[PDB]
Copies of this chain bind each other. A is one copy, B any other.
Amino acid sequence: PEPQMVLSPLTSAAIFLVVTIDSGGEDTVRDLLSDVASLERAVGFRAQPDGRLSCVTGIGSEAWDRLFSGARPAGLHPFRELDGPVHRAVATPGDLLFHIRASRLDLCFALATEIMGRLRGAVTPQDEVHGFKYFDERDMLGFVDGTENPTGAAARRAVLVGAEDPAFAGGSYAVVQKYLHDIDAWEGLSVEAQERVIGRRKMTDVELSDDVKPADSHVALTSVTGPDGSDLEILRDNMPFGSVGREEFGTYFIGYARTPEVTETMLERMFLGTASAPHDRILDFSTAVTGSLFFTPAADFLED
């Protein structure tokens, strides 16, 4: 089975589009799903090889039941709200996700325009974010963002559904959350204090040693080991976004995994805490304003 382009090369621009399916819009959606790979080639082919345009399409739990009969993917459910002692991870509506990436924002925009052109009248937009990465892979907090992502075979094993759910092999599960940052409070920390929040050195991106790394740092809480002592991994492609005039400085989080269990365990540690950590210190500078979960099928499932 041929996957979507979940494992993409590095891209410096993205558009995230989240929409809901209106009553009566199902047929128009199904038609667009069967064409979206052909649209990606149409927009992207003439700008190769620099363009690096791809679209990953996802489907939510409620929408799945409206669109398709027969089997459901084993791990597909609505995003679970987390109500922690201090911080909350909200659930927001979303039936379809389009994760569009390229080396330039204009290519993303052209593909987004063709997709939304086909869906006008059948869907209602819930969110639209235009992301850009800083030239040294830094995020809005000034830290390098992406470093410990898996690559090669390890990435395929962490991300792609396999024999455990064979009708949906080559699919993946995506979790999205839009975060807004309090940059004034963040910039009042010393660099060393910022390093203790994240768990890595700021300039050089070397991980803090085990003897200095706090238990409530982002890296400590999002490190999870499985039954057998192995690392449970996800693939992230976080993007900055914002608006200088409205004082909006953001990170759009997207995490792909072979089962939602990995990602959800990470989120529970961050928002609910553990015995050794009240919560992830990154959340004292970061508020989640969306939250949704999608299944991204194999490409050939959509092509039918």
Spell out A's residues near B (CB within 8 Å).
2, 9-10, 12-13, 15, 17, 19, 38-39, 41-43, 45-49, 51, 104-107, 109-110, 112-116, 120, 125, 127-128, 130, 132-138, 142, 144, 146-148, 152-154, 190-192, 200, 202-207, 240, 242-247, 249
**Contact across chains for B132 and A105 when beta carbons are under 8 A apart:** yes
Q: Which residues of B contact A130 (CB under 8 A)?
A: 130
Which of B133, B147, B203, B246 interacts with A125 by CB under 8 Å?
B246
Q: In angstroms, how far is the closest chain B Cβ from the Cβ of A179? A: 17
**Chain A interface mostly:** mixed
28 A–B contact pairs at CB < 8 A?
A2-B154, A12-B104, A41-B147, A42-B204, A42-B205, A42-B207, A45-B146, A46-B137, A46-B138, A47-B135, A48-B137, A104-B135, A107-B135, A109-B132, A112-B244, A113-B249, A114-B206, A116-B244, A116-B245, A125-B245, A128-B243, A136-B136, A142-B203, A190-B190, A190-B191, A190-B192, A191-B203, A203-B203
Q: In the assembly, what is the distance between CA of A247 and CA of B204, in Å? A: 19
